[PDB]
């Protein structure tokens, strides 16, 4: 039950495909029944730093005056 995904190649010469065109993939196969044994899939996300940077009981427009 193959888990084929795309690597993030830096368009390197003769790596399979780059500035001549083409993509690069890699096969994965979870082998153990217990999930906490799978390889850290590294396909992690990224949230907006707002819940820490911009946390206010209102909204802040940058071009506006801070302390209204």
């Amino acid at each position: 039950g193959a888990q084929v995904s795309s690597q993030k190649v830096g368009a390197h010469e003769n790596s399979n495909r780059a500035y001549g065109g083409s993509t690069i993939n890699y096969t994965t196969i979870n082998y153990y029944r217990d999930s906490a044994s799978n390889a850290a899939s590294k396909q992690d996300f990224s949230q907006d730093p707002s819940k820490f940077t911009e946390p206010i009981k209102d909204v802040l427009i940058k071009t506006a005056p801070m302390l209204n």
């Binding site: 707002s50 819940k51 820490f52 946390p55 206010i56 009981k57 209102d58 302390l67 209204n68």
Partner: protein, 267 residues
């Protein structure tokens, strides 16, 4: 439109009402605002009691005097309140108590004074003791100062008495009491009351903890720690003094498993 300028607010949780006029548009801990326990992530199986208005309202603790030699103050919320009306009585009556907060640190001067008070709300604020021999040995009676709260110090002083020790925290200020630089402390939900501008700071803190609902008598959650960033000065006068005073309000709180009354050795 009108004077609905960020500078004026009117908090009303429960039957109390704060109405400040230099108000620096308030902070909501982590975007996340206080709420009740969704059945989807609940834990204890009985019916959770909810004082609602009975507790939710604003309770003024006691005021702290603020001089030049003032080195900062620190409260332990879950505990800080323990007396304050019913949120005091319900506090003890149950084994489990999940409570959110709304801390409004009140403190105003004239246009002629100067200084900045960094009001930092640190989640799980484990302050460090004072015995170079044994670690964590800090006594409960002493570890939970309540309505009065504790106070940061200038430089560390090791507790030598060992026939029997003084078992207290010796929280140094530049290390935010928990051995970690103050200058970097601006990472927790916070507001700097900077005398020139705003004359208060309002942080709404939603219950944060590794558990759905946990204890209160035992485990603490949020802890406020106010430190003078810019020292207070007024006129070529020996020493000036303004009085900082916080008022906290427990929001969306609920408590489980009623029992007999808890009566901790706080003395």
């Amino acid at each position: 439109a009108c004077g609905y300028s960020d500078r004026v607010l009117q908090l009303t949780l429960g039957n109390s009402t704060i109405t400040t006029q230099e108000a620096a548009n308030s902070v909501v801990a982590y975007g996340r605002w206080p709420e009740y326990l969704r059945d989807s992530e609940a834990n204890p199986v009985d019916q959770p009691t909810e004082p609602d208005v009975a507790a939710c309202r604003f309770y003024t603790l006691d005021t702290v005097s603020w001089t030049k030699e003032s080195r900062g103050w620190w409260w332990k919320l879950p505990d800080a309140l323990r007396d304050m009306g019913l949120f005091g009585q319900n506090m003890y009556y149950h084994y489990l108590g999940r409570s959110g907060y709304t801390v409004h640190v009140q403190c105003n001067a004239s246009k002629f004074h100067q200084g900045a008070l960094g009001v930092f709300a640190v989640p799980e604020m484990c302050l460090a003791g004072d015995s170079n021999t044994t670690t964590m040995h800090t006594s409960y009676q002493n570890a939970n100062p309540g309505e009065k709260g504790g106070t940061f110090t200038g430089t560390f002083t090791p507790d030598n008495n060992q026939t029997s020790p003084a078992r207290r925290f010796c929280p140094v200020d530049y290390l935010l009491g928990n051995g970690t630089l103050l200058g970097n402390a601006f990472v927790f939900p916070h507001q700097i009351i900077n005398l020139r501008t705003n004359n208060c700071a309002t942080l709404v803190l939603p219950y944060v903890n590794s558990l759905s609902i946990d204890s209160m008598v035992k485990h603490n959650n949020w802890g406020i720690a106010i430190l003078p960033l810019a020292p207070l000065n007024f006129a070529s006068e020996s020493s000036p003094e303004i009085p900082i005073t916080l008022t906290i309000a427990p929001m969306c709180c609920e408590f489980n498993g009623l029992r007999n009354i808890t009566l901790p050795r706080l003395q």
